[PDB]
Design a binder for this molecule. Structure first.
Ligand code: FE
Ligand code: FE
Ligand code: FE
Ligand code: FE
Ligand code: FE
Ligand code: FE
Ligand code: FE
Ligand code: FE
Ligand code: FE
Ligand code: FE
Ligand code: FE
Ligand code: FE
Ligand code: FE
Ligand code: FE
Ligand code: FE
Ligand code: FE
Ligand code: FE
Ligand code: FE
Ligand code: FE
Ligand code: FE
Ligand code: FE
Ligand code: FE
Ligand code: FE
Ligand code: O
Ligand code: O
Ligand code: O
Ligand code: O
Lengths: 171, 171, 171, 171
C-alpha cells in the first residue's frame, strides 16, 4: 500500500473483526426493533429506541470501514451471525440484552485501544477516543438509567409499568 | 349503458352489497362514537377514535358508489341494519367488536377481489388494491396494537388502565 | 395472531427468506462501496453508486419487515452470508456483479409474487407491485445503460474510459 | 519561565525542529505551486493544489509556534533549506514528491508524539492528535487516490491524461 504508515497488520485485522461485531450488533438491534413492533408486543417507543441503535451501530461500522481505507488497511468481511434470540421478552429483558451487547462492544473497543496503544498507533487510539469511547459510556449510562426506571416500575404491576415507561420515557 | 365495458352484473351487485356493508359499518361506528361520549362512559379519546372510523367508512362507501357510476353500474340501496349492540361495554370490548367488524369488511373486500379476478376485471381488482386493501391491513394492525396495550393494562386494575390508555394513547 | 388474515405460512416464510436475501445484497453493496474507496482503486463516483444501493437494499428489507409485522407474520433471521468476492476488479466487473445480483433479487421478487398470487393474497402481490417490481426494472435498465457505456469506453484504453465514466456519468 | 509546567527541554527542541521541517515543506509547496503555473507547464489546477498545501503547512508551523509560546517554550529558528528540486516534472512526479514529503512530516509527527508520550506530556500528545495526525492521514489518503488516478491515466497517452486529471479532478 502506497499510503500505509504506522498501521500494523494486527490493528487492521482487529479493525476487520470489530467491523463484524458492529454488523452483528446492528443486526441484533434490527431484530429487537421489529420485535417490539409486533401486534402482540406493540411498544412503539421501545421499537424506535432499538431501531435508532441499529442505525447508530451502522454508522459505527461505516466509520471503521472508512478509517480502514484511510490508513491503507483492506476490509475483509465474514458472515454476520444471526441475533442470539428470536423473541426478546419484556422491555426489561430486552434492555438487559442491549446492555450486555453494549458492554461487549465497549470491551472490544477498549481491547482495540490497548492493542493500538501497544503498537504505538496514536491515530488509531485517538480515533476510538473521539468517535467511540464516549458514545459507549453515554449509551451505557442511559441503558442503566432505563433499567433503574423499569425496575422501579416492576414486579406485581409490571404490565402497567411497561406501558407507562414506553409512553412517558421513550419517544 | 353506453359506457359499460368489462363490468359484470355480478361485480355490480357485489359492489352494491359491499356498499350496504360499509353503510352498516359506518352506522356501527356512529353508535360506538356516541356511546363513549355518554356521561357515564366519558372516554373522549375512545369516542374520537370511533367517530373517525365512521367518517372513514363513509369515505369507503362514497368511493364505491363513485366507482359504480364510473363503470356504468347502477347503485341499489337496501335498509341499513342497526348496530348489533346498544351498550358497548369497556374499551377492550368495543375494540374487539371493531376488530371483528374490520375483519368482516376485509373478508368482503378479499371476496370481491376474488370475484373480479374471476371475471378478469383488473380495474375492479386494482381499485380495491389501491383504495381498500392496504387501509384495512393498516387499520387491523392498529386495532391489534390497541388490544395488546389494553390487555397489558387489564385485569385487577382495569379502570386505571382504561383511563391511562384513553389519555396517553388515544388523541 | 389476532390480526392475521389471508396470510399463508408459505408467504410468511418466503418473506423471511427474501429479507435475508436483501440483507445479503445490502452487505454485498457495502463491500463494493468500500472497495472503490480503497486508495488503490480510488473511484469515488463508483463508490457512491454502490453505497447508495446498500442504502436502497436496506430500505427494501426494512419495508419487508414492516409488512411482515402488519400482516401478522413473525420475522425470523438467519446468518447473513458474506459477499461472494473480496476484491471486485474494474468498474465493468463490479457493475456486472451488481447486475447479476439485481437479476437474482428480481427473480426472487417475481417468485414471491407468483407464490402470493397462488395463495390468492392480493395485498402481498400489490405490495410487491408498488414498492419493489418497478424499482428493480428501473435499476436493471440503469445498470444496463452503464454497462453499455463502459463497454463503449473499453478495451485498449480501458483506464482512461474508467476515469471518464466515473467523472462524467457517476455523481 | 513562570508558566512552564511538564514541558521538557527535549519536546521544546523537537518542536523547534518540527517547525523548521514545516517551514521547509511550506517552501517546497511554494516552489511546486509556481512551477505548475509556468507558461510551459500550465496546469492551473495542479498549481492551486500545491499552493493550498503551502498555506496549510504555514498554518501548521504557526500553530506549533503558538503552542511553543503557550507551554513556555522558546522558539528558535534555523535557515530554511531550499526545495530539493528546481523543476518538478509531470503531475505524477510532483505528486510522488508531495507524498514523500507528507510521509516524512507524518513520521516526524509520530516521533514527536512518541517523545512526548515518553516524557508523559499528554497535552503535547493531544495537541498533535487533534491538530496534526488526522490531517496527515486524510491528506496522504488523498495523495494516494490522486496517484492511483494519474497511474490509470498514464503511459502511452500520458499528455491527455494529465490534462483530463487537472480539468476533471483538480479544482
Ligand atoms: Fe430516540
Ligand atoms: Fe426464542
Ligand atoms: Fe427526559
Ligand atoms: Fe429521539
Ligand atoms: Fe427519534
Ligand atoms: Fe385519530
Ligand atoms: Fe345492549
Ligand atoms: Fe397497483
Ligand atoms: Fe394485480
Ligand atoms: Fe404514538
Ligand atoms: Fe388524529
Ligand atoms: Fe383527529
Ligand atoms: Fe447516485
Ligand atoms: Fe478475491
Ligand atoms: Fe395491482
Ligand atoms: Fe444524466
Ligand atoms: Fe444522486
Ligand atoms: Fe447522491
Ligand atoms: Fe483545493
Ligand atoms: Fe532540476
Ligand atoms: Fe470529487
Ligand atoms: Fe478547494
Ligand atoms: Fe480552493
Ligand atoms: O428518538
Ligand atoms: O385523531
Ligand atoms: O447520487
Ligand atoms: O481548492
Amino acid at each position: 500500500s502506497q499510503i500505509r504508515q504506522n498501521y500494523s497488520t494486527d490493528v487492521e485485522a482487529a479493525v476487520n473483526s470489530l467491523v463484524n461485531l458492529y454488523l452483528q450488533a446492528s443486526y441484533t438491534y434490527l431484530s429487537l426493533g421489529f420485535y417490539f413492533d409486533r401486534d402482540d408486543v406493540a411498544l412503539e417507543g421501545v421499537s424506535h429506541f432499538f431501531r435508532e441503535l441499529a442505525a447508530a451501530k451502522r454508522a459505527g461500522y461505516e466509520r471503521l470501514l472508512k478509517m480502514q481505507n484511510q490508513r491503507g488497511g483492506r476490509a475483509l468481511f465474514q458472515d454476520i451471525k444471526k441475533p442470539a434470540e428470536d423473541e426478546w421478552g419484556k422491555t426489561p429483558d430486552a434492555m438487559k440484552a442491549a446492555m450486555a451487547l453494549e458492554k461487549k462492544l465497549n470491551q472490544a473497543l477498549l481491547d482495540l485501544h490497548a492493542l493500538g496503544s501497544a503498537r504505538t498507533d496514536p491515530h488509531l487510539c485517538d480515533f476510538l477516543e473521539t468517535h467511540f469511547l464516549d458514545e459507549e459510556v453515554k449509551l451505557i449510562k442511559k441503558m442503566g438509567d432505563h433499567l433503574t426506571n423499569l425496575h422501579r416500575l416492576g414486579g406485581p404491576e409490571a404490565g402497567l409499568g411497561e406501558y407507562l415507561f414506553e409512553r412517558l420515557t421513550l419517544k
